[PDB]
Symmetry: D2
Subunit: 331 residues, 4 copies
């Protein structure tokens, strides 16, 4: 007989479903940073990669496979066909179009909508019960798009949203105070990037309100210019894009953090993009980052943060802008 | 007073030495994969990045820094100046030239020698007691080069060598047997890549010699073609390079594995590139992969593998070829 | 409304996906529990015992450490409804040896405990894997198989996984090498009658037996037999010194659990139904190297034994069948 | 030659050493938690009971295959503790029937009289992490006997009390304790102070949403959460005879911040003379920044008059006991 059969007596032919499967759709720098972070945190018994670029897809799958000795994730698979994604608990969408010279920003969005038109129904056919974690920008709009196309309930369609913006805020806060970001608390809500809202009232170390110690916190009067911390949350992202061409490491770690809460049913609170119609006087179908409880059914609950009238007004304006763009999209 | 001073009462000024510092020189795909793997395994209290490309360097450092909330490595620093590398326990060189159109292979090696001429003396000035882990290709030759330029004792100059080749071997072994690579034992020794030597006599699951069960193992008459496993160790590396343009994830994980043994003083046995003059009838100053015991002083010991005359001959030929190339290099 | 309802908007009313039960919260069960919690192998840990105060106190002590763990549900009770939907159920329950009590009486008392435990485990987790730790472990694994009616893939004894770990510790002390890099198998019975397979002892795939043919014989000037004597004697020594063993078995069980819960297909020396091998004709469980994954034991490795090694297993099988015939329970 | 020499050609101080003094249930829970978090390259155990000590060391050693801590040693001689970055004291006397509580304290002082100078001789630069009860008093005792600066003498303090608070908070809100923020300060156990003003999820003040929070009028009885912080500890002691797992995990958390220089903020017991109107040499839990030099910095928490009053009373009570102790 074969060497395998001389060495190994088989007890069962059984094939068996994967119990903790994650799919990443889009194997650019962002998708692969999600993949390595997820592999290094042991969140999956099976990792499936999907892309349209066959060579990049196969090469990334093989490079990870060659590291199997150093991992505890026993099955890594890839393909263009969504049958490789079957029975995923969680499917992370990092797929996007590359901006072309001589193209409007609405056209870039529409091109990402058309990608979602192909991706989302295929994901749903093979993993009807999965949670969808949307990373692709524009992330708040494309989370809406994935919800509409999927027909999933809102608990199972999640945008990565302000989880990274909040992590940057805490890094910068930590540098100012000489304290680890874990111990520096502070929330950025609403839109990912330029229009994000820093909730100054929630900024604390050891439950000590910085706003209470320093009432000028987050105003133009402020002698220490704490507003510059939130400006750097937006600008440092543009800075990394200008300096290396894209961001990967921080978003990959952020997504692995959301994946951890979902796969282990932790019910930790993260600022992610959820369907917010009914709150802060928003009457339209838009996704914005508020603090949500993440577990095995996706978003089970969200935290109603006490905002100032000004903070409430910024979210209403964001909802108006997002509904305006959403009405102009073709499904 | 300032918000910091209202919130935080300082007890002590002077900030001491880092106790578990790692430097990565070269922030390409390989250096950054080493960095993320090291960060995700908590092997360092301080990670220093060095490159010549200031924008890429700063951008990569900032991208990692933005992830600090998700890591347990409190200090991430970068610069062109080697003062940022001061007091490193371990310094990983992933710095290399990009092959030019029309450039000869000897010229590419000499250009990497000239990079080492700048890097190594600067590394030594700021971390005179560090272990050097050489990753840059050609890795066996450049480990020799780093030893000569550094003046370090041979215990503290290590090539990543066949640790990755051995991991690929075990991956492929595992696919054939339906067994995790951790439980599939097999050694690839000598040169990294094309001229690596599979030691068929050491291939085992649970201490059961595959060679003893199947004496044709690793010969041309073999009906199961086990030689194809070692062919794929070389060919799969070229395949990933063809498919994505380079390899990163597997080498990053391999280097983090060596770093773990060194930083934690594990005295695990790894196939790494060490100065092998005096063994297997090699009379020249060459570095080849044999199984070494790795700990806090680098290579303390090496394992004397019983080789066939053919296996011994392949290492002698590798030593001759490496000494031939080495005497043609200019310091 | 309530503080909860002012703070949190609920989206959905709330099954565990990765549940582990430990039956018996003695020193052994609790060492298994802390090891499992510290390796993040479960989303739910259930504890069962007959001593309600000890059980509740241990559950509460673990719960109070929740902040430092990533296992969001810890539950206990004497009622097996708390064990419902376990992937894996670890039996560490046992009677305390009395002065003057016969060996057969101790075994029968543990059989009577299994008479209550096993059918209750099966009712609430009909698809679980059973990991039997309670001594005598090879006999009680047989007992659990017969009472459960489970197929043999889903009934596993911890067996010689600990004996093999002790062997490698001792091997490592003699060679100055980490136990991870010291390979050596103890098979057959847990404890006194265990068989060291000298032929499989290797570092880096180098046979110690081939280098030193006296290895494991009485002629041996270095007395390597003393390594296997210490595998048995060091266990008795720890029992004499602290009254019991806990930490090593806890870590060993967490290692098996890791392979099962993550479907790793790593090879461990565990106790499996071995009728049909090495000329054994009776229904006995002995430790051979098994492939562990999500369906329990999928495959065995057929180790090449000497006639002497084969004879020791046959004698063990005869002794175990002799004791098994004298036990009272229904299948 | 020997098999070792046939197999291995030889070519050629611990960097991250932790000592645990006292190998009861508490010391060994600290040890397993530290081993399972990879915080040490060397673990040293010390006790006075030589057989228990040797047995515990051997049991851990037998698990080496499953660990990444390559050297585990024990002995009654403090030479095994040489060059420790961190030394955790879980050593203590067992309460005797009819023995007074001041006598139990003095007996623990006499144990520290032997332990602390030996620890200092072999690891003059170590951080001392004091766990033994009464923890705030015995931290003072270790500081006085050691002559160490206050940055390098740390009590485990309210790190565990704060973890219990967050567990209970989490059960009430259906949220992971990681995401439930709340601080217990001052004395470990009975006289601990819950800072209601800092209780938050996602930076949302529970006090602001529900101003009765932590008053007796409160219809939801949130004070019961802090009552359970104290009572649940007594409950575990009544049910299993002692606590081990939660304190072990808590100490591993402090050790992680110290060994990796994280500068995370923990409620640990530090020398508080000069702060919150305390005028005596006493150790109480306030939020401290922990790193490779021990406590580098304190967070100055804004307390209510009532919270401030509880700490000042604790300082008075602790100084009263401390002036009656014999060195
Ligand atoms: N709330 S929202 O969904 O609508 C939304 C709007 C805009 C952005 C900006 C944006 C884009 C992004 C890409 C593609 C796009 F097409 C758009 C976009 C921009 C503007 C749009 O609306 C219009 N602009 N001009 N005309 C229009 C219109 O359609 O009317 C639409 C899309 C943004 N990516 N991206 C990245 N972030 C990172 C990181 O590391 O944090 C790396 S990249 C960022 C954030 C930037 C770093 C700070 C992120 C968001 F989530
Ligand atoms: N023992 S050695 O140090 O001398 C040595 C020789 C050759 C190589 C081949 C090589 C090179 C490599 C790069 C740059 C170079 F300049 C050379 C090289 C080739 C030939 C050289 O010298 C000559 N020999 N005979 N004539 C000549 C000549 O000078 O023309 C010198 C350098 C190789 N990279 N590289 C990579 N590996 C990976 C991965 O994932 O495993 C990704 S890339 C590989 C391995 C191959 C993919 C499998 C790896 C080695 F380690
Ligand atoms: N293959 S087998 O199932 O039959 C079997 C037999 C004997 C033992 C011995 C044994 C027992 C043990 C307890 C209670 C028992 F009742 C028995 C037992 C053994 C054999 C019996 O056989 C008989 N029944 N009736 N007559 C006989 C007879 O002897 O002829 C009955 C009870 C063992 N515990 N135990 C522990 N190990 C550790 C540790 O850390 O390694 C901690 S404790 C050990 C191992 C010893 C330290 C090295 C472990 C085994 F797995
Ligand atoms: N801040 S302090 O240093 O002064 C101090 C005082 C009292 C205690 C109480 C205490 C003791 C403890 C043991 C021995 C003792 F001797 C004392 C003690 C009590 C009162 C004393 O003072 C007096 N005795 N008689 N009169 C007086 C006086 O007031 O003058 C002295 C010692 C407590 N252990 N212990 C444990 N905790 C746990 C756990 O998991 O949390 C497990 S055990 C606990 C905490 C309680 C379970 C919740 C913990 C502390 F930190
Ligand atoms: N949410 C956040 O905070 C952040 C989001 N991002 C977003 O992540 C996305 C990806 O960024 P990068 O990886 O750098 O981009 P990239 O362009 O490198 O990769 C996107 C990938 O999507 C693939 N793709 C396109 N159409 C596809 C289809 N139909 N099916 C499958 N795959 C398809 C492409 O082939 C490509 O590999 C972008 O939208 C980016 O803005 C980036 C950083 C942070
Ligand atoms: N030993 C092994 O098993 C493997 C080794 N490698 C080697 O790793 C090296 C890097 O690979 P990639 O990341 O793909 O290359 P890359 O070309 O993307 O990056 C190398 C980096 O070195 C930098 N550099 C050049 N001169 C420098 C100097 N004087 N000081 C500091 N930095 C300097 C460059 O700026 C560049 O960022 C290559 O030599 C490659 O062959 C890669 C695969 C496996
Ligand atoms: N397989 C191995 O390598 C090893 C096995 N062991 C075995 O582990 C077992 C436990 O060891 P220790 O924890 O030291 O024992 P222990 O006597 O301290 O605790 C055993 C626990 O079983 C509980 N128990 C008894 N009847 C029960 C029932 N009907 N349902 C549920 N729980 C029940 C007891 O109440 C007790 O809490 C022993 O049989 C021992 O021989 C221990 C060492 C190594
Ligand atoms: N700070 C906190 O939050 C908590 C503190 N603890 C404290 O932990 C301590 C230990 O608790 P257990 O392990 O249950 O106690 P235990 O009495 O079982 O163990 C204490 C050990 O100290 C040893 N010891 C006594 N004198 C010694 C000396 N001169 N040198 C070295 N070792 C010596 C004893 O031999 C014994 O093994 C107690 O003080 C307890 O109150 C307990 C839980 C929580």
């Amino acid at each position: 007989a074969t060497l395998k059969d001389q060495l190994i007596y088989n007890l069962l032919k059984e094939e068996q479903t994967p119990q903790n499967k994650i799919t990443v759709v889009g194997v650019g720098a962002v998708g692969m940073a999600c993949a390595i972070s997820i592999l290094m945190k042991d969140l999956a018994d099976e990792l499936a990669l999907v892309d349209v670029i066959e060579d990049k897809l196969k090469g990334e799958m093989m490079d990870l496979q060659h590291g199997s000795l150093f991992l505890r994730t026993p099955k890594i698979v890839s393909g263009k066909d969504y049958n490789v994604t079957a029975n995923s608990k969680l499917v992370i969408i990092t797929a996007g179009a590359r901006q072309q010279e001589g193209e409007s920003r609405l056209n870039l969005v529409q091109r990402n909508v058309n990608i979602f038109k192909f991706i989302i129904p295929n994901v749903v056919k093979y993993s009807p019960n999965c949670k969808l974690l949307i990373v692709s920008n524009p992330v708040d709009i494309l989370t809406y798009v994935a919800w509409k196309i999927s027909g999933f309930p809102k608990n199972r369609v999640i945008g990565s949203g302000c989880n990274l913006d909040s992590a940057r805020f805490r890094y910068l806060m930590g540098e100012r105070l000489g304290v680890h970001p874990l111990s520096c608390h502070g929330w950025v809500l609403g839109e990912h990037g330029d229009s994000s809202v820093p909730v100054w009232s929630g900024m604390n170390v050891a439950g000590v309100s910085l706003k209470t110690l320093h009432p000028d916190l987050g105003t133009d009067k402020d002698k220490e210019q704490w507003k510059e911390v939130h400006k750097q949350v937006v600008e440092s992202a543009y800075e990394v894009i200008k300096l290396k061409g894209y961001t990967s490491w921080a978003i990959g770690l952020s997504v692995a953090d959301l994946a951890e809460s979902i796969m282990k049913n932790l019910r930790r609170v993260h600022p992610v993009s959820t369907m917010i119609k009914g709150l802060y006087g928003i009457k339209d179908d838009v996704f914005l980052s508020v603090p949500c409880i993440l577990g095995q059914n996706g978003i089970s609950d969200l935290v109603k943060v006490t905002l100032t009238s000004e903070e409430e007004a910024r979210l209403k304006k964001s909802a108006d802008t997002l509904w305006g763009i959403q009405k102009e999209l073709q499904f």
